[PDB]
């Protein structure tokens, strides 16, 4: 009667920490014969320890081997604690154990091979521990075993062939382990299996055909393994199957057409299974299928119209395949269809008007296809439309002017089509637009003032159209992050309100007609990493305020009329990789502060009025690699000696100056691939190391009479 209680005390000696109640109620009192009122304990009719339940206490220690002394133990619940150490093989001695839950601990080493002795054991939870080693075959010989959860351990080796011995096993979870080898054919003999989680392991070989012997199967996950061979699955069994996920394996063959047999299937997911061949017609037999994801395979052929018979279809993900043909009009028929993801395929023809008429579709992701046709006015009638990415297709015609009225557009990316006409004023009517991508079309006209109103726009890409006119003013509390307008006809001054968008990261205004001065307000943009104003009619000077943009990687103002001296305050853009001033009126001599930017790998200041000489400071620039272009500055002097320090410099254009000097210093550029010295007054011979390119590009030395030969 005291025996179990004494057993509990030895076990207690193995514990690092216990709740205060354990400290206070577990102890020998000459007036107490039994542990039955002790904190974690529940006793028998006969007053022996029936249950020991420590769950979700903070208990640290080991489970001592004395646990085997409790021959009346029914429930042992240690779940969710700090336990560590090995699981004792003497547990195989608790002859009455029904439930054994060791989950969510730090248990380590091997799973005991003695659990076989437990004739009454129903549920076994080992999940979320540090367990390791092989799985004992005896583990599937536990006679009454119903549920077994091994997930999240370091377990390794094969799924034991004895798995076929477990005729009571209902739910078996092995995921997130090191299990390797072939799935044993004997798995089909485990006849009760409902839920089978084999995913996230190291398994190889084929899905065994005997998986078709399990007629009580609901849930099968074999994904994230290394499996090959055909997927031989589907049969008159699998009428109970709700969920199938085979994703991330390398199969040889296609989607098995036999899946037509599994009438209850809710979700069919094989993403990246190296599947080739055709999408089977038989998939149209599935009335309950809410998810079909075949994406990232080698799938060919057309989409069967029969899929328009999957009445419950919610997600159809076909993306990243070789699929061809027209999108079946039958799909518009599905009134539960939320997301149609066709992108990155070979689809052609128009999107059938049925699909454009869907009041269920939120997301139409068709980009990177050969699709074409005109955008119908019906599109403006899809009330649930949120994301539409039609980019990289043959779509033509105007964008319907009402797009955005029956509101709630979030993302419009139409880039890279043949679209003509103006930009619709209503795209932001619902005040949800994050992404307006119209770039690379035939569009024209100005930017509607209403679009300027949309503060939710994060990414605005109009680049490469026939757009023209002035820019909108932008607001404080505008979300603009990425702006690219390059290659248009935009004119007028750069709006100063652009500096108010605190989250602005990237600005490309290049190849436009912008005039006037660069607004000093742009000094407010401290998240700006990239700025391209190049190729405009910009004039005046660079505001020193731009020194406040501390995040700048890339700054290109080239090809404008800018003048003045380069502000020395710019010594603080400590992230600058790229500086391009070429083709302007800049003066005040070549900037000295350049070495302060340790990150500068590209310096092209060509064709300005800088004057003076090449500074010796130019010689300590740590990272100069891609180009150094000083050409066309009326630079006078000789090549300063420090310049020979640039041993990472790949290209040098010094040409078209008044430099009168040796050319000797160039022996020191050890990485130089290309050089251009022309129309200079350099006296004396050519250095040795410029030969190979001197052989191929002799032109680069012209305008220097006094250059000699070796």
């Amino acid at each position: 009667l005291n025996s179990d209680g004494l057993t509990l005390l030895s076990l207690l000696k193995h514990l690092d920490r216990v709740p205060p109640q354990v400290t206070s109620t577990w102890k020998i009192n000459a007036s107490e014969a039994t542990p039955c009122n002790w904190f974690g304990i529940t006793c028998d009719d006969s007053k022996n320890v029936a249950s020991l339940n420590f769950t979700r206490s903070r208990v640290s220690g080991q489970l001592g081997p004395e646990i085997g002394e409790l021959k009346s133990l029914q429930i042992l619940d240690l779940s969710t604690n700090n336990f560590s150490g090995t699981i004792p093989s003497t547990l195989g001695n608790c002859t009455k154990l029904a439930t054994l839950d060791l989950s969510e601990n730090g248990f380590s080493d091997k799973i005991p091979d003695t659990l076989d002795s437990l004739k009454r054991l129903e549920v076994l939870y080992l999940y979320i521990n540090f367990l390791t080693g092989e799985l004992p075959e005896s583990l599937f010989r536990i006679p009454k075993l119903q549920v077994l959860y091994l997930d999240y351990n370091n377990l390794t080796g094969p799924i034991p062939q004895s798995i076929g011995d477990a005729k009571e096993l209902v739910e078996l979870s092995m995921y997130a382990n090191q299990f390797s080898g072939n799935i044993p054919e004997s798995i089909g003999n485990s006849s009760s299996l409902q839920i089978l989680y084999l995913h996230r392991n190291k398994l190889v070989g084929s899905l065994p055909e005997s998986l078709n012997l399990l007629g009580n199967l609901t849930t099968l996950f074999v994904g994230n393994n290394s499996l090959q061979g055909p997927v031989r699955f589907g049969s008159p069994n699998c009428k109970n199957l709700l969920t199938l996920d085979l994703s991330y394996n390398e199969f040889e063959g296609g989607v098995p057409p036999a899946l037509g047999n599994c009438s209850s299937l809710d979700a069919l997911v094989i993403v990246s299974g190296n599947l080739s061949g055709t999408i089977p017609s038989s998939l149209g037999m599935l009335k309950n299928l809410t998810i079909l994801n075949l994406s990232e395979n080698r799938l060919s052929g057309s989409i069967p119209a029969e899929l328009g018979n999957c009445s419950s279809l919610n997600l159809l993900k076909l993306n990243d395949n070789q699929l061809v043909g027209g999108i079946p009009s039958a799909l518009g028929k599905l009134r539960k269809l939320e997301s149609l993801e066709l992108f990155e395929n070979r689809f052609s023809g128009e999107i059938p008007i049925e699909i454009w008429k869907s009041q269920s579709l939120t997301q139409l992701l068709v980009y990177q296809n050969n699709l074409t046709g005109e955008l119908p006015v019906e599109m403006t009638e899809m009330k649930k439309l949120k994301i539409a990415t039609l980019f990289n297709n043959s779509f033509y015609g105007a964008i319907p002017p009402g797009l955005g009225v029956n509101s709630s557009l979030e993302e419009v990316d139409f880039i890279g089509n043949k679209l003509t006409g103006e930009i619709p004023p209503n795209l932001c009517h619902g005040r949800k637009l994050r992404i307006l991508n119209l770039g690379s079309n035939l569009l024209h006209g100005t930017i509607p003032a209403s679009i300027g109103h949309c503060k939710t726009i994060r990414r605005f890409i109009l680049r490469e159209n026939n757009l023209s006119g002035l820019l909108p003013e932008f607001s404080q509390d505008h979300s603009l992050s990425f702006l690219d307008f390059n290659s248009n006809n935009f004119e007028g001054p750069i709006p100063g309100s652009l500096g108010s968008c605190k989250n602005l990261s990237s600005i490309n205004l290049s190849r436009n007609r912008f005039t006037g001065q660069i607004p000093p307000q742009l000094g407010n943009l401290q998240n700006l990493g990239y700025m391209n104003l190049s190729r405009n009619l910009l004039e005046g000077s660079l505001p020193a305020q731009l020194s406040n943009c501390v995040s700048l990687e890339r700054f290109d103002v080239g090809f404008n009329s800018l003048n003045g001296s380069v502000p020395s305050n710019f010594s603080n853009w400590k992230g600058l990789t790229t500086l391009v001033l070429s083709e302007n009126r800049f003066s005040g001599g070549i900037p000295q502060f350049l070495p302060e930017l340790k990150k500068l790998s590209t310096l092209q200041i060509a064709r300005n009025a800088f004057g003076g000489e090449i500074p010796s400071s130019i010689g300590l620039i740590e990272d100069l690699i891609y180009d150094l272009d000083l050409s066309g500055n009326g630079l006078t002097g000789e090549i300063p000696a420090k310049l020979g320090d640039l041993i990472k410099l790949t290209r040098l254009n010094i040409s078209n100056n008044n430099l009168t000097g040796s050319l000797s210093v160039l022996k020191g550029l050890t990485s130089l691939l290309h050089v251009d010295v022309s129309n200079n007054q350099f006296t004396g011979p050519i250095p040795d190391n410029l030969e190979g390119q001197l052989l191929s590009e002799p032109s680069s030395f012209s305008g220097n009479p006094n250059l000699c030969i070796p």
Binding site: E171, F221, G223, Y367, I387, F391
Partner: peptide, 17 residues
């Protein structure tokens, strides 16, 4: 038996420019 159902693979979300 005990816990919540394991979720099926999402695949890759659609991108934009």
């Amino acid at each position: 038996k005990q816990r919540g159902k394991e979720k099926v693979s999402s695949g890759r979300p659609g991108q934009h420019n």
